[PDB]
């Protein structure tokens, strides 16, 4: 059995990828098993000069889906 | 008891009483007490004269304390001063010698605050 790992920055894209992946492989599938979302957080200062007390927060969220059996540029595929 | 010319405190645990020696802290006291064998939890008023002798000979053998250590430190500082190194003139004018900031702090080397 080979692992199909989908990582995507967009949620709906990852559901779409998992869904047509299972559709085309249906082979016995385990289903799009979700994996914990990975969050990267950064805090920056709004003003170019001074004004440190004013901060803005950004994040990048990575959704992970797992396919165990027996594409849009947003989502990757790792086959192992 | 009189140990190397130092009067030990009246009632102290042995290693911490030995800490009162100028050349001994706590780690030194603990390791020397382990080496010679006398108990560490036993008080100063329970010392036998043979115990005083064994600590005396051990300390005089493999340790340097009190006047010799003081004069060696003083000589080292003076020699560091007289060679003209950075730490030399740092010692001469009573300023911190390990790169500490002096804009605001360093009252320890400057002494008590003076006003002008």
């Amino acid at each position: 059995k080979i692992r199909i790992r989908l990582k995507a920055y967009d949620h709906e894209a990852i559901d779409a990828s998992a869904r047509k992946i299972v559709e085309t492989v249906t082979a016995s599938v385990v289903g799009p098993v979700p994996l914990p979302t990975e969050k990267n957080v950064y805090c920056v200062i709004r003003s170019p000069h001074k004004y440190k007390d004013s901060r803005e927060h950004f994040e990048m969220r990575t959704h992970k889906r797992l396919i165990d059996i027996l594409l849009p540029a947003s989502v990757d595929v790792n086959i192992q | 008891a009189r140990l190397v010319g130092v009067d030990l405190p009246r009632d102290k645990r042995m290693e911490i009483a030995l800490t009162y020696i100028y050349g001994i802290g706590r780690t030194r006291s603990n390791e020397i007490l382990a080496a010679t064998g006398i108990d560490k939890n036993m008080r100063t008023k329970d010392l036998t004269d043979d115990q005083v002798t064994v600590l005396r000979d051990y300390i005089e053998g493999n340790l340097k304390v009190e006047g010799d250590l003081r004069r060696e430190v003083q000589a080292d500082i003076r020699r560091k001063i007289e060679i003209g190194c950075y730490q030399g003139l740092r010692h001469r004018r009573g300023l911190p010698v390990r790169g500490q900031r002096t804009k605001t702090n360093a009252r320890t080397r400057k002494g008590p605050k003076r006003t002008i």
């Binding site: 920055y9 950064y42 920056v44 200062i45 803005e56 | -």
Partner: protein, 60 residues
Amino acid sequence: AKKALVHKANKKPKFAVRAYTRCNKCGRPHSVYRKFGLCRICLREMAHAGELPGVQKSSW
């Protein structure tokens, strides 16, 4: 920053202790992010413009 320093940043020397980040688009030496290679101001502006695929505002 100055053009000369920006160009000098790209040279590979025999000694790597000197390499500075110097964010790519404007050469700002301070506050450079390794993941994007951009300074805080440029990172914020491009994130707001949506040019970074995944970065967005925070709320929690």
